[PDB]
Design a protein around this ligand. Structure first.
Ligand SMILES: OC[C@H]1O[C@@H](O[C@H]2[C@H](O)[C@@H](O)[C@H](O)O[C@@H]2CO)[C@H](O)[C@@H](O)[C@H]1O
Lengths: 134, 134
């Protein structure tokens, strides 16, 4: 990926990942990917400030064998350009749980039926400051 | 080895990398590698409890183009199996500065003179719990 890439994570069901970073000042959006590898993603977390027709909307999706799944969009957008963003993601067998900066939480189905998350990657618009595992 | 592996870290001169991890309860030693890739390590940080003929000794080395350099041993050992340990690493063109769990810090020559440190890898005896950039 463009930003920080972490592998061999072996994040098991019930375990979580907390990521804090800085969103590019001139970023139309940023990405945090979680999955098995670059082509198999359980969660493509993509807050869009202004991209692909989306204005301030969180878009989430899966990627199987390189093929994008069906997108999911949220009703809140607790992110501000050129600022710090902290998200926590919990992996579980049925669903991944995402907790946002405003306290809002949502779930995304574990479509790939992964037994663990071994891959994480941020793009060029999200500069990671810290990553923690509980 | 089998621990967490990170790439595209983009650690720049003067920037601090804080790594906190769990030292395996049965560990005879553990490793934290930092550099460009598996064949080019600015720092092979290897605390040894009882391994390779050494006892409770911190051994550091570099690896350039695959070749191991001259090992450096520290005069203190603030580590123990089955416990959490945090180390901080910073660097300039001349040396890398490594700060240990108790506040003790030493310098290791920057033998590879990399523009930035982009790779990190822990072995099976050091379970990384957190990585932070300052
Ligand atoms: O699904 C994530 C994926 O979206 C791509 O953009 C989509 C867009 O979201 C959708 O509204 C449109 O119909 O198709 C586009 C092409 O897939 C992004 O380009 C890609 O980066 C991902 O973010």
């Amino acid at each position: 990926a463009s930003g920080l890439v972490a592998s061999n994570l072996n994040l098991k069901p019930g375990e979580s990942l907390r990521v804090r970073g800085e969103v590019a000042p001139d970023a139309k959006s940023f990405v945090l990917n979680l999955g098995k590898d670059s082509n198999n993603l359980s969660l493509h977390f993509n807050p869009r400030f202004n991209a692909h027709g989306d204005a301030n909307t969180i878009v989430s999706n899966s990627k199987d064998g390189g093929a994008w799944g069906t997108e999911q969009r949220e009703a809140v957008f607790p992110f501000q350009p050129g600022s710090v963003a902290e998200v926590s993601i919990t992996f579980d067998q049925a669903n991944l749980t995402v907790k946002l900066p405003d306290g809002y939480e949502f779930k995304f189905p574990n479509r790939l039926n992964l037994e663990a998350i071994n891959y994480m990657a941020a793009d060029g618009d999200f500069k990671i400051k810290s990553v923690a595992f509980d």
